[PDB]
Amino acid sequence: SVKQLGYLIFECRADVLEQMVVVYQDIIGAVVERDEGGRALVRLDGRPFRIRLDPGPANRLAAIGWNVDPSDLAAIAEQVEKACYSVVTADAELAADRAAAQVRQFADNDGFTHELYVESSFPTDPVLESLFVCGEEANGIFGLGHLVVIVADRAKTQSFFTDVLGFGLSDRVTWPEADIFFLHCNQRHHTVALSAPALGLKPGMVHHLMLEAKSKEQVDRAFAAVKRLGYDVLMTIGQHSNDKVYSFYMMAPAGFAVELGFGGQVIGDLESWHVGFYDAPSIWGHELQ
């Protein structure tokens, strides 16, 4: 199965790109490097990038990078093809662009581009690693965070993630406004969550992205920074009922929410995880506006 969410690549209009650098660098506290082409490489560990912003004519999620073990790549790609998505082999330039040893790409019916990839080695970055839960940790494999997406047909997409990509269901959170399905592929409580269309959102939209700090104080600081820098909060500090994350949400200029959280529930043993069910998304806090 998929090992972890290894990278995300977004395209942004020129002004939106510069504004997103503020989000990642000056609120989230990630390291953001710039290259010769004006790209922004958002780093949370030793990897050259975990999130990359590329200039483009429209704001969109351009690629989702699913890291897989070398021994699983060909096999997973085969199951994707059996599910009737065409899988193309990336050339050397594309693989190197992703800082990956190999990449196979496909697009789904919801308009997302997926890339199954084998990782290239990269050095440790002790300072940065002390700040974010990302990739390989002492207590397991986590990837970079989670992505929550809106899709036309939740059940079908859930079946693809589950039966093709090898994700397991963590829990379902259901209340009058929404019905969300949280999926894991490693220690992180969820790497992806799925919803059908709802007030606001349409198939193929990103609901939010989440990054995970290694201390509660990072979250409080970032939250203060949103306010101090004169921005607006989407959801105030709170704790989710399912993942137990201490987090807040902000609306980013690229048109989706960004969540910074702490203390996410770990899936210790995937084989014995019990699917949970919750009637409310939060224990306390998380006040809209």
Sites of contact with Fe ion (CB under 5 A): 210, 259
24 to each of 32, 42, 247, 261, how far by Cα in Å? 7, 7, 16, 14
Q: Three-class SS string for the chain? A: CCCEEEEEEEEECHHHHHHHHHHHHHHCCCEEEECCCCCEEEECCCCCCCEEEEECCCCEEEEEEEECCHHHHHHHHHHHHHCCCCCEECCHHHHHHCCEEEEEEEECCCCCEEEEEEECCCCCCHHHHCCECCCEECCEECCCCEEEEECCCHHHHHHHHHHHCCCEEEEEEEECCEEEEEEECCCECCCEEEECCCCCCCCCCEEEEEEEECCHHHHHHHHHHHHHCCCCCCEEEEEECCCCCEEEEEECCCCCEEEEEECCCECCCHHHCCCEEECCCEEEECCEC
- Residue number with CB closer to Fe ion (63 or 147): 147
- Residue number with CB closer to Fe ion (119 or 259): 259
Instruction: Provide, rounded to whole angstroms, the least separation between the CB of residue 205 and Fe ion.
Output: 15
- Residue number with CB closer to Fe ion (61 or 210): 210
- Residue number with CB closer to Fe ion (52 or 208): 208
Instruction: Provide, rounded to whole angstroms, the least separation between the CB of residue 163 and Fe ion.
Output: 24
Instruction: Provide, rounded to whole angstroms, the least separation between the CB of residue 277 and Fe ion.
Output: 18
Instruction: Provide, rounded to whole angstroms, the least separation between the CB of residue 107 and Fe ion.
Output: 25
- Residue number with CB closer to Fe ion (210 or 213): 210
- Residue number with CB closer to Fe ion (80 or 238): 238
Instruction: Provide, rounded to whole angstroms, the least separation between the CB of residue 127 and Fe ion.
Output: 26
Instruction: Provide, rounded to whole angstroms, the least separation between the CB of residue 8 and Fe ion.
Output: 14
- Residue number with CB closer to Fe ion (210 or 250): 210
Instruction: Provide, rounded to whole angstroms, the least separation between the CB of residue 186 and Fe ion.
Output: 16
